[PDB]
Amino acid sequence: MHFNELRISQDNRFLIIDVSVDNQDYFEDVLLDSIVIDTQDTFVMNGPSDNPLYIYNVEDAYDTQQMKNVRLELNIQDLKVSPCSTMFFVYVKSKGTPSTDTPCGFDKDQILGTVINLQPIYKQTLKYLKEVECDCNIPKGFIDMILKLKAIELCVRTGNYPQAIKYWNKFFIKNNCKSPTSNCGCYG
Amino acid sequence: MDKMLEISEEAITRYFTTLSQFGYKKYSDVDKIIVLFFMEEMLAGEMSYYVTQDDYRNIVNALYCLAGSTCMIDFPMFESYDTLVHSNNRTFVPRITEDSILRSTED
């Protein structure tokens, strides 16, 4: 299993998820089971919480390439959460058995990928951007913002999710964003 | 443009918010506010017909000096999906362990 596109729309409407099982024949049998969405408030160390934010069973649809690749366009207002002040955990469970002779570790039935709205963090960093121009001084705000972002980045990439939640709460939980207007802005 | 409008409204609203909280704003920044809204009315009026693309380049590159100059004016954020180093998501699929006269091959 792997992630193709895991992102929040820059208009702060849609939590975009696009999962697809690996194309290698080892994993031909394995199929996607469900999509579970958790936030920093409903996160548990192992597996999804027993009180998630959204559940989506793949098998309640056409049942095989359609089953191997799934995509969602969840609107965030139906989830009753803030697009910018929330950090989502996307769990994908697979149903099946990978054929033998696959190297171990590749046969991980569960995969986890997080999500954050980077636009408000860029909005904060732009305030200190011009410190880079001014020589004779350390751009301390720019450095602080970069390190704040990379703390979350590294803690995510190493699997140290609890400290990642702690840093997100310390830094970015008070982020603000322009709530998208329900009347669709018409253009094309 | 429709964005010089937003920047000007934000800037002057912040100006009057400061004059509400405090009773003083640097006139070195009132100069920047004056330049900003003067440019926006210049570009949203009957004088937008005298501008070439070189003039557009110069105007934008001169307005970006006002971007982070004061708190009233901010760096605008556009919808961008690019970066200086992009990701390579292409996949490798050779044909029955074959090669060309010099190199490998795929589907």
Binding site: Q24, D25, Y26 | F92, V93, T97
Partner: peptide, 19 residues
């Protein structure tokens, strides 16, 4: 690195999988 032969065989095996 030396890449003894079974490593090359592993690389062949993986690459030839989605071949």
């Amino acid at each position: 690195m030396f890449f003894t032969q079974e490593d090359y065989r592993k690389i062949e095996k993986w690459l030839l999988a989605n071949s």
